Symmetry: D3
Subunit: 245 residues, 6 copies
Amino acid sequence: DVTSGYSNLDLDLRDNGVCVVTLNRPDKRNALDVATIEELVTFFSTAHRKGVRAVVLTGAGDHFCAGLDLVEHWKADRSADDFMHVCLRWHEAFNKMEYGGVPIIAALRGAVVGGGLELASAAHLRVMDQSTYFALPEGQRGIFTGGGATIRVSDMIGKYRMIDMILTGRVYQGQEAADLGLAQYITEGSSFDKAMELADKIASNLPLTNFAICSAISHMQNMSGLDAAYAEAFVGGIVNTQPAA
Amino acid sequence: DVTSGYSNLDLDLRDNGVCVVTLNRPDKRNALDVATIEELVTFFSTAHRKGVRAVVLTGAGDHFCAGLDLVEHWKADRSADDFMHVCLRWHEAFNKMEYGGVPIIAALRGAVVGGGLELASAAHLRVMDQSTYFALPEGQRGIFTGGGATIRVSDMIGKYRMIDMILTGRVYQGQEAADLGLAQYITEGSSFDKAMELADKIASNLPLTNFAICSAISHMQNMSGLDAAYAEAFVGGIVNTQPAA
Amino acid sequence: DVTSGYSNLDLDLRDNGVCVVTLNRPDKRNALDVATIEELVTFFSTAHRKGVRAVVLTGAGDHFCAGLDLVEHWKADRSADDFMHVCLRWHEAFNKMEYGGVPIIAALRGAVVGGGLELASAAHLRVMDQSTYFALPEGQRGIFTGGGATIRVSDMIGKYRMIDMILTGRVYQGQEAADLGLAQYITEGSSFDKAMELADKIASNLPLTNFAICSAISHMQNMSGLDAAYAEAFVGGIVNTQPAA
Amino acid sequence: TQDVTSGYSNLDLDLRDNGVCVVTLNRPDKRNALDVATIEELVTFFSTAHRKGVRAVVLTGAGDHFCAGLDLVEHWKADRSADDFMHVCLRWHEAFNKMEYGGVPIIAALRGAVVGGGLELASAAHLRVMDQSTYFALPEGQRGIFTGGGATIRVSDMIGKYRMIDMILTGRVYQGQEAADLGLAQYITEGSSFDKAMELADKIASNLPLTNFAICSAISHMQNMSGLDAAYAEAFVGGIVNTQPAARER
Amino acid sequence: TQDVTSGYSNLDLDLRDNGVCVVTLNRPDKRNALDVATIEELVTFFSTAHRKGVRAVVLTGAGDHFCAGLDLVEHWKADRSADDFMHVCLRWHEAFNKMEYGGVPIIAALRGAVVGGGLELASAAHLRVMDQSTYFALPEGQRGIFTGGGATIRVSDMIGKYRMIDMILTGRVYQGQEAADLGLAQYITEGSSFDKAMELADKIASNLPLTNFAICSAISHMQNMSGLDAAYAEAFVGGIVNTQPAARER
Amino acid sequence: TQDVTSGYSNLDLDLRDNGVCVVTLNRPDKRNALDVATIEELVTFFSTAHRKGVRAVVLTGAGDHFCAGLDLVEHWKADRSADDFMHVCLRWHEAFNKMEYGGVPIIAALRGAVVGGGLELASAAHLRVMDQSTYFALPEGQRGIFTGGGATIRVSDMIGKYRMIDMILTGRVYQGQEAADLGLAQYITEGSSFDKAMELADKIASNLPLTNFAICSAISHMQNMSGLDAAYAEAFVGGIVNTQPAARER
């Protein structure tokens, strides 16, 4: 019951458990409105229990994701509390992606900007192609990132590089972007095909091992290394003694 | 009342709110004595409320800053508690810079060493030129960094690279230094002019947006990502619904 | 009484206080069994009080360390709690290395894989040669890292690169590995000789300064920067006012 | 509004006109022991309560005992591996995190046994009201069992780490005023804990939604941070909550 | 020494010969409500007290009530936006952080209302002395207001997160021995809280400056860290404090 | 089994047949003041107790007083520099960390003075049993000394940061039921604290080794984390402990 029914996500579940999840509004470069965020909360809250083994996340069209749907935003005439609540929903979706235990590999193309970079950062692995570029351009437009960029992008490229990106609108692309920490993989070919290659290999690993890799490590990074040491020992104890292992 | 009156800092407030703050003792490569640290505490404690929009921090002369004023130090014949108190003042100055909400862009030249690298690290952005080099040389002289290097330089280049720098006295310069994380910008020309270009653009952004960028992100990095998610939503709520925004 | 007596470690204490510590089972690429881990706990729990000034850690033979002794592991038929306890011993050894206050420089050759990369990560400095390669290959074999990789390797190369390494089994070597953060030094010659050069220089520094560098910095990185600021001031107060300093 | 009470099997739900929803465990025959299906219903209810418009929740257990803890019959029969049980524990934690950090005030009306996983459920509420029949314990420890539903976090936050360690290490039982004074419940009544909980809930429901949302989510987050970073976050929560038009209106 | 008492308008200051400085809120006509100008004077006083040589502070409010909290008249009139109010809250936090982490022992002599922002101010002191007229509350919540001056941090540290949530969610008032036992004040007197605070302050002022500095700054920092990292920092604080020549002299 | 009791000079050790080991400080002539050699023996004993098979420890001091704290005679004579003393403090911390996080339940049987470093030692135990002669204080502060053996961490966890600050800032002494209620000891007896500690230890020793190990190590680690990360770790501790064959057997 994985492909249940979603309006704003196109799903393709392959026989080995890899589910392609595609943002489906290329006419607006897949900008994320509140309904799409809720479908991401739902999908990533249930993916593990529904048996999904890995996810390849992509955006329909030439551009991965332009970020916050500004048309919806401007029209909603939001108060500070209304917008704070919208941001909590973005965070719920991305927390379910990051800490959910289902490996997520993003196949990037074109503009990975603003909230779109926040969505890409919620994946475990990112594959960029020759057309891909990254930025947090809204900062210069007076907009602060409220979907996790200050957390995940800093974890990806360093707090001072993330501050630079939002303070100046600086753009990164090509090898320079991969080397900075924006994506672990860069291809001269299809980022979708490379993501699928990675996803198929990951899906052939043990479910429990991938679950721990895709949830425990982020938690350990939130604590003192002297307390994470103890938690890591328990994670290794459970994962490495499973019959299948 | 920004250029009020300081003995150890030369100030130049431009019409757009950018304030150039220049260490003014080139004869001693701008080494930082206790009086200069107190003026940095005062300036950065009040800059935001005095209306400063951005700061370009520089050192008069060929060298940004040589660090701790050792002549004052040796002559003061400090006990462990006396020196601990001096370090707390350094930290107060740099905390007001980092968490104060006023964007600070350092225009580096020559030696950015020891406490001088600690001062540069307290800025949000760093611009280095072709003469700039970085080191924590005192470590080999038996001196531990007590002005935040263990915190900020580790945040800039990684804990293990910071440990290497103080343990061995290793020097970095050129593109290698920029790539390591010591400065986000490297220019073949004037680091002052490049810093001013960046500062003028930043000063044209909304005051509240820059305030959040230059205070909230450092705070979020000090907490678990699962708690920063909630705080970030409130920061976005306030910043993105301001009338000006 | 440094070279006391160990079965699984070969020790060579030099006249300047540098102790070479060599894993001594090249026939199994120095895989770490429980007895070797206990000797590492013992050696690194007492090295500082026994007067060791620096340690050069190496593996006998062409390969630094292959990781967990799988023959012992499979034969022990471990329950989840048995294995959790083994992981706590690995962590105790590596915590004594990291926070013990005695500088440790690892001279790497060949395969630095799995638990072997966890051991190398517990050193302060790493020197790699032209034959050195790094990986966490067990992940694809269903094995989770329970000896600190999720903590230290993430601190070395970034959480998302560490997740990539264990999720995919990706290998790094050469300049690419040094640049990623796996080793601060890469040599075209002998990694042992380069490690000794570094170690001899470090051993000529003050004992207290090296102790603080090799214990305080890791602790500061486990707290909010606003609380580490205060602790760092006390560390600087004690280190910088010692008579020898 | 939206339907709040339909579609559940393991929770009895009663939505009052002022937005207070009574959530009642409904298996007194097994002292409301929590099986995996009940935990999943708690996840669903507490993941959606705020957005559905629920203003406050009074949590109770049908019968003489609030909740005896994890359903051991189900546990025993399942012959769970360490990973299977770790997964069950993560679901308990998801339900309790949605209760604690969800922003909807929860007031537990306690009676009889509030033990093991039942004390973990009670600890996920913001307020607890106990009566003269109420008693508290973490007895599983004496049975070789560790608390995997938050007791080590929330009960420590309620009574102190060393008193929580004592309870699980020794099976020590607390009741009456001593239990209230220890930090196990903020309110103790000589009468009906349900009626006192409803009094508290009706007053809470009369306050502003955003103010209750912040009180019932932000404070727990602030306690997980250094006080020097929570200071900054609290200033932003105060800025949003205290300038809402409805607050000025008051 | 340096001048400590001059130049202020919203604080009455009295420096005694042994270094104890009485700091008194001086607007009893409005129950010492704290406006932005008073907060700024607290920032200035507590940012410089240690370096000026102040050995201890006895903090009090003129009149029958210590402090009723934020100045609502000023608040209402200012018609503040969320960002304007967030900025006001950061100033309150700066004043209270300089009190808590500044290294100068602060003993609050309480009387009457210690409510809302007034309880936040009292919580920024190291020690609190209450009298028989003293009462505590965070009533703003019932008025749709959230505490933005540290109550969620310090009052939780004083009485427990769940009792702090209770106070702001319900407006519950505490007084007398019950308040002292809850953790709202370490000392309760049947007489003058000011006189008891001065007794405590005079004894504290007789101890070594560095020892009091560490006690009144390091402990709060240690509580923001994992205990396994605070262990290391505490060893360095002990090393510096316990080997100062003056300590040996004792 | 392995030898547990031989080879020590500064600890009297008595291993009972059920695995409870009585560890007794043995210098009543100096009220069991802790010198560096005794701290090193505590490091050795508590670093190996779990692996040697010790099931629980009852910690006591010979004579009328549990422990008066750091050995000042040794301290004074050593004329320690700040770094020398910081190093001594790290050894105290290593001994107490091995006690707190080692996984072997420790029950302290207190009598008489539990002061300064002696309260730090007592605080490293999981449970404390006090008698009618027992009193607690951190008097060193009045003597210009700061606690460098964990009091700022563990005593704060026991009684609250503000009560710990009060104790060291003022030298305040606690005893009797007031001390127990404050959080200084979970058990108070009108009889023998040693006999009550042995009763508790014998019951604890009858429980499963792994369950006691987790209770006596995991909970302290969880309290050093955000509750949202401890939730995940606790689920893994529950998974391992609750599926061990011996637990099912129960």
